[PDB]
Amino acid sequence: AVGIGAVFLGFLGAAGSTMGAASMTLTVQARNLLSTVWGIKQLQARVLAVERYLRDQQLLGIWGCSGKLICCTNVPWNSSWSNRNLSEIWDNMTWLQWDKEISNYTQIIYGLLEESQNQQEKNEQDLLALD
Amino acid sequence: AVGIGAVFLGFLGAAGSTMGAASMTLTVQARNLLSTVWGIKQLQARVLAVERYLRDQQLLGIWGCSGKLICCTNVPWNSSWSNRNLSEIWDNMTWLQWDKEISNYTQIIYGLLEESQNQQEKNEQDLLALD
Amino acid sequence: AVGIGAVFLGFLGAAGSTMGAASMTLTVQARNLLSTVWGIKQLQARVLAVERYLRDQQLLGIWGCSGKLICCTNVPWNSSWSNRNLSEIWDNMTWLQWDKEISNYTQIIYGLLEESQNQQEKNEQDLLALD
Amino acid sequence: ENLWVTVYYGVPVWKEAKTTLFCASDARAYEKEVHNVWATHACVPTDPSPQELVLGNVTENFNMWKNDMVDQMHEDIISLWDQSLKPCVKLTPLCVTLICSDAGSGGVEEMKNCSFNTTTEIRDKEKKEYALFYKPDIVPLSETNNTSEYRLINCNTSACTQACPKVTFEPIPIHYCAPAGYAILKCNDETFNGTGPCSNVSTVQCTHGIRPVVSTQLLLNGSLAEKEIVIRSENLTNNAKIIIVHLHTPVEIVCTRPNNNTRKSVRIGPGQTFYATGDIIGDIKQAHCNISEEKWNDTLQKVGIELQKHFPNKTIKYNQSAGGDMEITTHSFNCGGEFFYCNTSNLFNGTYNGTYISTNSSANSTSTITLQCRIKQIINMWQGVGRCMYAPPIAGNITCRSNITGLLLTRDGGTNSNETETFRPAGGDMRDNWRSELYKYKVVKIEPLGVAPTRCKRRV
Amino acid sequence: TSACTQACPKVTFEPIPIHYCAPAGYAILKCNDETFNGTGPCSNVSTVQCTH
Amino acid sequence: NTRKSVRIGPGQTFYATGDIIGDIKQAHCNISEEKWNDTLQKVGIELQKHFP
Numbered sequence: 025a026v027g028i029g030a031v032f033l034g035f036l037g038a039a040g041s042t043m044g045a046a047s048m049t050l051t052v053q054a055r056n057l058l059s060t061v062w063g064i065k066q067l068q069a070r071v072l073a074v075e076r077y078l079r080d081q082q083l084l085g086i087w088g089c090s091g092k093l094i095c096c097t098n099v100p101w102n103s104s105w106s107n108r109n110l111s112e113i114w115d116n117m118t119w120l121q122w123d124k125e126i127s128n129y130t131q132i133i134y135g136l137l138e139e140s141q142n143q144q145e146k147n148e149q150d151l152l153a154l155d
Numbered sequence: 156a157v158g159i160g161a162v163f164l165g166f167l168g169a170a171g172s173t174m175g176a177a178s179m180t181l182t183v184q185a186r187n188l189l190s191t192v193w194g195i196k197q198l199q200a201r202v203l204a205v206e207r208y209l210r211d212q213q214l215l216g217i218w219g220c221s222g223k224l225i226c227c228t229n230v231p232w233n234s235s236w237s238n239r240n241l242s243e244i245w246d247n248m249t250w251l252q253w254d255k256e257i258s259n260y261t262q263i264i265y266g267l268l269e270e271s272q273n274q275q276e277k278n279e280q281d282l283l284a285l286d
Numbered sequence: 287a288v289g290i291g292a293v294f295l296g297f298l299g300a301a302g303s304t305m306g307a308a309s310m311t312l313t314v315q316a317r318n319l320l321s322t323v324w325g326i327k328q329l330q331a332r333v334l335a336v337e338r339y340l341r342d343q344q345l346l347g348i349w350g351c352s353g354k355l356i357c358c359t360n361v362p363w364n365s366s367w368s369n370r371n372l373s374e375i376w377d378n379m380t381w382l383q384w385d386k387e388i389s390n391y392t393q394i395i396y397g398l399l400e401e402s403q404n405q406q407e408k409n410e411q412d413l414l415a416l417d
Numbered sequence: 418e419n420l421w422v423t424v425y426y427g428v429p430v431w432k433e434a435k436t437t438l439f440c441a442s443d444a445r446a447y448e449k450e451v452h453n454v455w456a457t458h459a460c461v462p463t464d465p466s467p468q469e470l471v472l473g474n475v476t477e478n479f480n481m482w483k484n485d486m487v488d489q490m491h492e493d494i495i496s497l498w499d500q501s502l503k504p505c506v507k508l509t510p511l512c513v514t515l516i517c518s519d520a521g522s523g524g525v526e527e528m529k530n531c532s533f534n535t536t537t538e539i540r541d542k543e544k545k546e547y548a549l550f551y552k553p554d555i556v557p558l559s560e561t562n563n564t565s566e567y568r569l570i571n572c573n574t575s576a577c578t579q580a581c582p583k584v585t586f587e588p589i590p591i592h593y594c595a596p597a598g599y600a601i602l603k604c605n606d607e608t609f610n611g612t613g614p615c616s617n618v619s620t621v622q623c624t625h626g627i628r629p630v631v632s633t634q635l636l637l638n639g640s641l642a643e644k645e646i647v648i649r650s651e652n653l654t655n656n657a658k659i660i661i662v663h664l665h666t667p668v669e670i671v672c673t674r675p676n677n678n679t680r681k682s683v684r685i686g687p688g689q690t691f692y693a694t695g696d697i698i699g700d701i702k703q704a705h706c707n708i709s710e711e712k713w714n715d716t717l718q719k720v721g722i723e724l725q726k727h728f729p730n731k732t733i734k735y736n737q738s739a740g741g742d743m744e745i746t747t748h749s750f751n752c753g754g755e756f757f758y759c760n761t762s763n764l765f766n767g768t769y770n771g772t773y774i775s776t777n778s779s780a781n782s783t784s785t786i787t788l789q790c791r792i793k794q795i796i797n798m799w800q801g802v803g804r805c806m807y808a809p810p811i812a813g814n815i816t817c818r819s820n821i822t823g824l825l826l827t828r829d830g831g832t833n834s835n836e837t838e839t840f841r842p843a844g845g846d847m848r849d850n851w852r853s854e855l856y857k858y859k860v861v862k863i864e865p866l867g868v869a870p871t872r873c874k875r876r877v
Numbered sequence: 878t879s880a881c882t883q884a885c886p887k888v889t890f891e892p893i894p895i896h897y898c899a900p901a902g903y904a905i906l907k908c909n910d911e912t913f914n915g916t917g918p919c920s921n922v923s924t925v926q927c928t929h
Numbered sequence: 930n931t932r933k934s935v936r937i938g939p940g941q942t943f944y945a946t947g948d949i950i951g952d953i954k955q956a957h958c959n960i961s962e963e964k965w966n967d968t969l970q971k972v973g974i975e976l977q978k979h980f981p
């Protein structure tokens with residue numbers, strides 16, 4: 025479902041469709057993360073937007089996903105987090121219900137990804153030192 | 156273009172020249188962008204500088220060619236934007252009047268690049284998950 | 287330095303160990319690098335923190351070493367900078383006195399890294415033009 | 418066959434958040450000089466193409482009474498009013514005794530004369546001057562039955578600051594844009610009573626034109642409803658929550674004044690000059706507000722038939738406000754630069770018993786309702802800001818061709834086994850006005866990261 | 878008309894020269910034509926970060 | 930006694946001392962003798978380390 029017609033979705037445009045049609049729309053939603061009493065409320069907002077975008081980009085870039093949107097890791101998915109089928113997840117939901125059911129189990133996932141990234145870099149250094 | 160050697164100036168010294176001497180000059184050009192009443196302007200200049208740098212890097216990073224300085228992409232070039240020969244474009248004109256001719260269709264080209272990159276990453280995930 | 291589990295210590299809590307065992311404590315510890323007149327001072331602190339982080343990221347991005355933590359290059363290590371064995375360096379020495387012993391010879395290393403990256407980019411463009 | 422973690426960047430999910438919002442105004446307010454209202458020097462110019470997008474399957478839970486936008490707007494408008502009174506004349510030397518008599522041989526009877534002794538530009542010398550002050554701005558300073566010694570009402574609590582007569586109090590509409598990485602939702606439902614789920618949530622990057630009018634009862638210029646009368650309230654059980662009625666059709670209101678001669682320039686100190694009322698040439702007449710009779714009657718009847726849904730077998734009655742000072746129990750507003758405080762004992766004098774009464778008469782529209790107004794100059798709107806602004810007088814007659822969009826009722830405390838629940842008007846804080854206007858919107862925070870399992874294992 | 882604020886006798890009105898510098902991301906175009914009358918095209922345009 | 934509210938200017942009242950009722954005594958501070966004496970003795974024995 026790459027054809028939306030007018031490409032103006034503005035952080036929100038595919039928040040109701042299924043996940044199969046919501047993984048094709050990541051660029052138009054990731055494009056907009058950057059772009060006197062009222063002379064300072066304008067200027068604080070730019071600073072906080074730059075702070076939040078830099079935090080998200082750093083946290084993405086720690087575990088190897090440098091600039092890719094659909095990036096893949098080698099952390100094994102524990103069955104004690106979802107307990108549902110793959111096709112049921114990718115067809116019967118949108119991202120909002122998944123965010124509601126994942127929000128307790130996020131920091132363990134982030135720690136596992138960062139540990140696996142450190143293991144990958146150490147193994148890559150050892151493999152490049154083998155030659 | 157590349158045979159300057161002693162390059163401490165940088166900036167935009169290839170302006171008004173042929174594109175053949177202006178496309179292969181990027182290997183030596185690199186970038187030098189980030190190379191009381193007067194304490195409130197230092198702050199605003201710094202915020203707009205970091206905002207412009209982050210916007211430029213984000214736009215280079217959405218269509219997946221971050222840190223390359225030349226990106227070959229497979230968006231097909233529509234004839235309605237040029238309607239003309241390639242050789243006279245690359246051996247007859249400068250970048251300024253080319254920008255004056257092309258500024259009416261920048262957003263459509265940018266949207267096509269974003270869609271092609273998202274299709275590339277979805278196909279990459281599918282092909283790498285076949286194994 | 288992998289059985290900590292709950293990682294909340296930063297670069298503070300792992301220094302003084304050997305650099306062989308202090309190279310696997312980088313991820314969350316580098317995630318900790320971002321997280322009237324008082325408001326202007328606080329916003330100046332935020333702006334200088336963002337500027338320092340992006341200066342470090344630009345320094346990683348100049349010599350082709352971005353998006354990775356353990357990131358090793360092909361610059362030949364001159365023996366006059368260290369004059370000591372590798373086993374002593376990586377088994378009986380910490381990061382602090384290595385920084386004390388290396389701080390007089392940093393700009394030459396940075397220039398050599400930049401020149402090696404420029405040569406590698408020229409070789410990459412030549413290999414692109416060959417195929 | 419196995420599942421692996423896969424990171425997506427660009428995920429459309431939301432959390433609740435509070436942030437700092439912009440100001441966006443139209444481009445026509447920037448081409449004039451500096452310091453017109455508040456928005457010439459400050460707000461960004463909005464683009465003339467607001468992109469509104471409708472979300473497909475999205476259902477969201479709104480809350481009108483739990484909003485940060487109303488508190489943020491209240492703080493911003495308080496700060497703007499405190500900032501606009503900084504480079505203005507502070508009338509401290511007007512605390513002297515005022516020698517007041519009647520305004521003439523059976524003259525005004527509402528404005529005293531009050532000749533005083535003022536300070537000229539040279540602090541050695543003094544000059545005798547005079548003005549015409551209104552009756553509510555003067556108190557009888559006397560320890561006995563002396564009818565000639567008077568003083569201002571402001572030299573007892575905290576000073577003044579005369580409003581600079583080059584800015585205007587005209588309510589230019591302002592939009593509230595959201596910062597980057599944040600979004601503003603907008604409930605497009607028709608039966609939206611303020612709290613509850615919405616099935617037509619839309620995308621708005623910067624809200625519509627909000628006119629920051631100041632009024633206690635009878636909500637002036639603003640957005641109407643769409644298909645019927647909509648009643649907003651928090652609980653409808655306790656009698657301490659201000660029930661808000663959103664009208665569907667406006668009712669015309671016009672207000673006038675007599676003809677003052679001019680503003681009188683009296684110089685105090687080195688270069689400061691306060692402007693005071695001079696003569697009143699012509700005759701002395703009353704300031705009054707006019708509302709059509711049949712339109713108000715069937716508007717109030719439609720409010721009754723929409724309020725009878727919540728109260729099944731009870732009659733609806735109205736009467737006056739429940740006593741107090743003139744700044745609470747009267748419909749007060751500000752346009753033309755002169756403040757009004759108008760009595761509302763004729764508007765809310767009626768009843769409804771469940772039976773509709775038609776008004777089939779088009780030639781009887783000449784009959785109307787007049788309200789006896791009073792005009793003040795020392796103004797005490799907002800507590801805790803320095804509410805002693807002196808509004809300078811204005812030269813000619815003024816007209817108030819305005820528009821009504823709402824009401825602010827308040828249910829009375831009923832007695833035992835009552836079936837005649839009476840509704841009284843009430844004013845209060847400005848959060849009721851700016852929550853009647855900002856009921857649609859809600860600010861959210863975009864979180865682009867998100868993990869999900871699939872069959873994608875990263876190649877080594 | 879107004880009220881003075883007396884200039885406090887420790888500041889000096891000496892015209893110290895200042896340079897106006899563009900922010901990082903902008904450039905200042907400078908014309909080096911000696912017969913430039915103020916309005917019109919230039920031919921020896923040079924790019925400098927800061928003024929004289 | 931109670932602070933006596935003296936009003937000067939518009940709403941700029943300052944509070945001065947009113948009367949004094951009862952007899953008039955002296956303000957003072959009280960430190961124990963034994964604790965201060967052996968505290969000064971301990972300060973002496975830890976200052977004896979730096980002076981022979």
Ligand SMILES: *[C@@H]1O[C@H](CO)[C@@H](O[C@@H]2O[C@H](CO)[C@@H](O[C@@H]3O[C@H](CO[C@H]4O[C@H](CO)[C@@H](O)[C@H](O)[C@@H]4O)[C@@H](O)[C@H](O[C@H]4O[C@H](CO)[C@@H](O)[C@H](O)[C@@H]4O)[C@@H]3O)[C@H](O)[C@H]2NC(C)=O)[C@H](O)[C@H]1NC(C)=O
Nearest residue numbers: 585587630631637638750751752753754816817818819820
């Ligand atoms: C609710 O909505 C109504 C309808 O818009 C608002 O009513 C308007 O109120 C404003 C001021 O609050 C009125 O503007 C004033 O109009 C006066 C008369 O205008 C006539 O005469 C002029 C020539 O003098 C003609 O150009 C004009 O077309 C009319 O025929 C003016 O004399 C006023 O001028 C003042 O302001 C200007 C600029 O600031 C100064 O240069 C002047 O010296 C002077 O100080 C002013 O322009 C407007 O007329 C009203 N509308 C109508 C239809 O009457 C309500 O204010 C609004 N809010 C509330 C709370 O009710």
Ligand SMILES: *[C@@H]1O[C@H](CO)[C@@H](O[C@@H]2O[C@H](CO)[C@@H](O)[C@H](O)[C@H]2NC(C)=O)[C@H](O)[C@H]1NC(C)=O
Nearest residue numbers: 520521530531532545546547548549695696697
């Ligand atoms: C208010 O009182 C003043 C002072 O008594 C009046 O000003 C006087 O007006 C008469 C004309 O009727 C002049 O002859 C005097 O010279 C004025 N006195 C001055 C300027 O000190 C004033 O008219 C009174 N106000 C009204 C509305 O009548």
Ligand SMILES: *[C@@H]1O[C@H](CO)[C@@H](O)[C@H](O)[C@H]1NC(C)=O
Nearest residue numbers: 037038040041042472473474
């Ligand atoms: C809303 O739900 C219907 C019902 O499944 C679906 O067909 C439609 O595509 C959804 N809307 C969007 C924008 O996906």
Ligand SMILES: *[C@@H]1O[C@H](CO)[C@@H](O)[C@H](O)[C@H]1NC(C)=O
Nearest residue numbers: 171172173174176246247248
């Ligand atoms: C004019 O531009 C061309 C680029 O096509 C350049 O080679 C030439 O040197 C320029 N002329 C002068 C006098 O510099």
Ligand SMILES: *[C@@H]1O[C@H](CO)[C@@H](O)[C@H](O)[C@H]1NC(C)=O
Nearest residue numbers: 514516533534535543544545
């Ligand atoms: C002001 O008027 C005259 C002139 O200074 C003076 O005699 C008089 O006492 C002053 N006060 C009043 C209240 O008139």
Ligand SMILES: *[C@@H]1O[C@H](CO)[C@@H](O)[C@H](O)[C@H]1NC(C)=O
Nearest residue numbers: 555556557570572573574940
């Ligand atoms: C003057 O102020 C006091 C409080 O300081 C108040 O009690 C009194 O009512 C005020 N006078 C009038 C006339 O309101």
Ligand SMILES: *[C@@H]1O[C@H](CO)[C@@H](O)[C@H](O)[C@H]1NC(C)=O
Nearest residue numbers: 471604605606616617618619
């Ligand atoms: C939601 O509101 C929009 C506003 O224009 C309207 O066009 C649309 O029909 C509404 N949705 C439904 C289902 O009525």
Ligand SMILES: *[C@@H]1O[C@H](CO)[C@@H](O)[C@H](O)[C@H]1NC(C)=O
Nearest residue numbers: 651652653654655656657658
């Ligand atoms: C306010 O609403 C809540 C929720 O319905 C209710 O429990 C409570 O009794 C109400 N308050 C009063 C005073 O009735």
Ligand SMILES: *[C@@H]1O[C@H](CO)[C@@H](O)[C@H](O)[C@H]1NC(C)=O
Nearest residue numbers: 734735736737766767768839
């Ligand atoms: C309105 O309030 C007054 C105040 O006591 C009361 O006497 C009267 O009965 C009420 N109702 C009507 C219809 O006036």
Ligand SMILES: *[C@@H]1O[C@H](CO)[C@@H](O)[C@H](O)[C@H]1NC(C)=O
Nearest residue numbers: 737743746747760761762763
């Ligand atoms: C309003 O009008 C009524 C009757 O017309 C009168 O009794 C009352 O005093 C007036 N003023 C106020 C403040 O209610």
Ligand SMILES: *[C@@H]1O[C@H](CO)[C@@H](O)[C@H](O)[C@H]1NC(C)=O
Nearest residue numbers: 737762763764765766767768
């Ligand atoms: C209210 O309405 C009644 C009936 O029309 C009328 O007799 C009365 O004079 C009005 N005013 C007051 C203050 O009761």
Ligand SMILES: *[C@@H]1O[C@H](CO)[C@@H](O)[C@H](O)[C@H]1NC(C)=O
Nearest residue numbers: 673674813814815816817818
């Ligand atoms: C009052 O002012 C209005 C301006 O809107 C004017 O039309 C009207 O004629 C004035 N009234 C009189 C009696 O002149």
Ligand SMILES: *[C@@H]1O[C@H](CO)[C@@H](O)[C@H](O)[C@H]1NC(C)=O
Nearest residue numbers: 638639667668669819820821
């Ligand atoms: C109030 O209603 C009248 C009648 O249609 C209309 O002309 C006027 O524009 C309305 N006022 C506002 C501020 O929209």
Ligand SMILES: *[C@@H]1O[C@H](CO)[C@@H](O)[C@H](O)[C@H]1NC(C)=O
Nearest residue numbers: 908909910911920921922923
């Ligand atoms: C342009 O300016 C440079 C600056 O040094 C100068 O050397 C050169 O002669 C100038 N060219 C002309 C044609 O004036």
